[PDB]
Each structure stands twice: as structure tokens, then as C-alpha cells.
Write a protein that binds this DNA or RNA. Structure first.
Ligand SMILES: Cc1cn([C@H]2C[C@H](O)[C@@H](COP(=O)(O)CP(=O)(O)OP(=O)(O)O)O2)c(=O)[nH]c1=O
Ligand SMILES: [Mn+2]
Ligand SMILES: [Mn+2]
Ligand code: NA
Length: 323
DNA sequence: CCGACTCGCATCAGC
DNA sequence: GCTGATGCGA
DNA sequence: GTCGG
């Protein structure tokens, strides 16, 4: 109990979570373990028994028993076995390549493809996404310091303005909450030519411009509203980074900014209280619920705070939206 | 006991 | 060819 | 996996 508290426990749960998702293809068990780890990581005491943990929300009989075994013996038989298993271990590892999920990792391992070498020997069996994830395997597992994030913002906002002075672009995600470190760059984008009732050609032009100045280096996926790609600060070379660009209608922009800024936990808390007050919020709109529960028409939103107001909540600055 | 627990894009199965 | 299903990362 | 209905 030094790393935060219950670090040994949260790592245990996270590992179990990873095998459920990657080997068992059980997203819900995966989410249960991660939630349980997140509750425990916040619990301000060193846990001394499964019974104590069982009283936490999201901790049931099974994770309680795992904790008693971990506390009594210093390990978990099930995790040690999983850890040493060639097939489970290799399946779990390969999903760390972006574009290889549980299904592709299982097929690869079935035909003897188990390592990065194996993948590099068999590039022909990889789709485009998977090829790039392989290419930048190490880069993609590095975190992005805020200062590189700011340099990256400088480039995104400048180049967007150069395409069209009318574009609005906002870096959201952990960056906007003031995180000192980020896993990727999330960019929201809008324009007056694009409303909920309106050829978008607005995302392609920005993507194209960022490729011309050699900021974006590869494309993982690109449609009329969402781009997923790779980018790189100009120089010893900087790591290649993940960037997502989303084009959203102007009249749903602040709903998107809120959704793609806030931590997942924060978004959940706000969705709950919004129901409490008879509102349903998604990433694009806020709607009132009628007396039966049916949804009305979207309400006007001219500011992130307008959303807080609708549901009678004190404005929470992005820096304070970790939960 | 037992079912519950979002979306845009790429690719593939199949028609 | 196209449509729908499945996979994927968010 | 946990937790309701
Ligand atoms: C995946 C996911 C995302 N969101 C919103 C909120 C999130 O903040 C924003 C950016 O998403 P992400 O880039 O994937 C992680 P992030 O917050 O930016 O932190 P880092 O990337 O730096 O690790 O989208 C959800 O509401 N529910 C979700 O399930
Ligand atoms: Mn992010
Ligand atoms: Mn992202
Ligand atoms: Na993956």
C-alpha cells in the first residue's frame, strides 16, 4: 500500500480486466473489473480484507474473494496461471497493436502469429490500420507531455484558421482539463456552413491542410465527420501521436465540447443528474423528458454553461471535471 | 434467476 | 456491384 | 464481473 493505496489490488483488477476483454471477449466483465479498480483506487484507506472491500460499490462476492486471497498470500493463483499461459498471454499482448482487437488477436494466435516479429513477418495479413499500429507500436504507448500538446495545438489552430477564418476548433480531452499528460489529441471542429439541418468537405480540407504542412503523417480512418490519424511535431524526432478530429454541427457544438472534454466519470455524473431533472443529454443535444419519459425537441445551447443551467448545476470549469 | 450493463468508419460475409 | 454484420478505437 | 428487476 504505497502507490496511491491498494496499488497491488488495482493492478490485479486491471490485469483481470484486460484478460476478460482481450481473451474472454467479455466487455462487461472487463468494465466491472475496471470500475472496481477505479472505486478502490479512490478509497482512502489500505484495504485489509475482502469483507471490507465488499462494502464498496462495484465490489461483489467474487472480487472480494480475490482480494482475500491476494491479501492472505500476496498473489492470485488465477492471474499467475493466466500470466504464464502462452496463448492467453500472446492474445492479450497483440491487442496492444492499434487495430488488433480481441478477435484479430485470437485468429493471429491460432495460426502461430504471436509476437511483433511474427506480425512484421506477416504484414500481408494486416489491414491498413493494423499496419500503422504496428509501425508506431512503441510511439503509441507513450504519453504526450502538455508542452508538446501546446506546440501541437499551436499547429492545429493555426492551420485550421489558414483554411477558413470561419472554422472553430477546440482541443478537448484531457488536454482541456489541464492534464499535465495526454494519451492523444482530441480536436473538435465546426463551421457556420454545417448545422443540424444543413458536401461537408470541411473535415477533408482541414485534414488535407494538416497533411500538406506534414503535421498529420498517416490516416487510420476518415469519413465526413470523424478522422482518426497520426501526427508528429517537427524536430531528434518526436514520437508519432494519435489525433482524432471530429466535425460537429454548429448548433450541437457546445454539447460536443462538453462531452469530448469531460472525464468519462464526469460525463456519467452529469447524465445522471440530468435525468433527475427530466433531461436527456447525449454528445450532441440536451432534450427535456415529458411526463411519460418521451424526449422533446433539443433545447438551444449557446454555451457549455447553458447545459449546466438547464439541469440547475453550478458551472464546473473543465479543469475540475475529473469526476 | 437472470438479463443489463454508443457511435463512426473499415472490412468482410454474403446476396 | 450492393447491403448488413462484425470489428475496432474511442 | 456486479447489480438491479
Ligand atoms: C472513450 C470515451 C470518451 N469519452 C469522452 C470523454 C473523453 O474525455 C473524451 C476524449 O476521449 P479519449 O481521448 O478516449 C480519453 P481523454 O479524456 O482525452 O484522456 P487521454 O486521452 O489523455 O488518456 O471523449 C466518453 O465520454 N466516454 C468514453 O468512453
Ligand atoms: Mn484524449
Ligand atoms: Mn481520443
Ligand atoms: Na488493439
Amino acid at each position: 500500500p504505497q502507490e496511491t493505496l491498494n496499488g497491488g489490488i488495482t493492478d490485479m483488477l486491471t490485469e483481470l480486466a484486460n484478460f476478460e476483454k482481450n481473451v474472454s471477449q467479455a466487455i462487461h466483465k472487463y468494465n466491472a473489473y475496471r470500475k472496481a479498480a477505479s472505486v478502490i483506487a479512490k478509497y482512502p484507506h489500505k484495504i485489509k480484507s475482502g469483507a471490507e472491500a465488499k462494502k464498496l460499490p462495484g465490489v461483489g462476492t467474487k472480487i472480494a474473494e480475490k482480494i482475500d486471497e491476494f491479501l492472505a498470500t500476496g498473489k492470485l493463483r488465477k492471474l499467475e496461471k493466466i500470466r504464464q499461459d502462452d496463448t492467453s498471454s500472446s492474445i492479450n499482448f497483440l491487442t496492444r497493436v492499434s487495430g488488433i482487437g480481441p478477435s484479430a488477436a485470437r485468429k493471429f494466435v491460432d495460426e502461430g502469429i504471436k509476437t511483433l516479429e511474427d506480425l512484421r513477418k506477416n504484414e500481408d495479413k494486416l489491414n491498413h490500420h493494423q499496419r500503422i499500429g504496428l509501425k508506431y507500436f512503441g510511439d503509441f504507448e507513450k504519453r504526450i507531455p502538455r508542452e508538446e500538446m501546446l506546440q501541437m495545438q499551436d499547429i492545429v489552430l493555426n492551420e485550421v484558421k489558414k483554411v477558413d477564418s470561419e472554422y472553430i476548433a477546440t482541443v478537448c480531452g484531457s488536454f482541456r482539463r489541464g492534464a499535465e499528460s495526454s494519451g492523444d489529441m482530441d480536436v473538435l471542429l465546426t463551421h457556420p456552413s454545417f448545422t443540424s439541418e444543413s458536401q461537408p468537405k470541411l473535415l477533408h480540407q482541414v485534414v488535407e491542410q494538416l497533411q500538406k504542412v506534414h503535421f498529420i503523417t498517416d490516416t487510420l480512418s476518415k469519413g465526413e465527420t470523424k478522422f482518426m490519424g497520426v501526427c508528429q511535431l517537427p524536430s531528434k524526432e518526436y514520437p508519432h501521436r494519435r489525433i482524432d478530429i471530429r466535425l460537429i454541427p454548429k448548433d450541437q457544438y457546445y454539447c460536443g465540447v462538453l462531452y469530448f472534454t469531460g472525464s468519462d466519470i464526469f460525463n456519467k455524473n452529469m447524465r445522471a443528474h440530468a435525468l433527475e431533472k427530466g433531461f436527456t443529454i447525449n454528445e450532441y443535444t440536451i432534450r427535456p423528458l415529458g411526463v411519460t419519459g418521451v424526449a422533446g425537441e433539443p433545447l438551444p445551447v449557446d454555451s457549455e454553461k447553458d447545459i449546466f443551467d438547464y439541469i440547475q448545476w453550478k458551472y464546473r470549469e473543465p479543469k475540475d471535471r475529473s469526476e
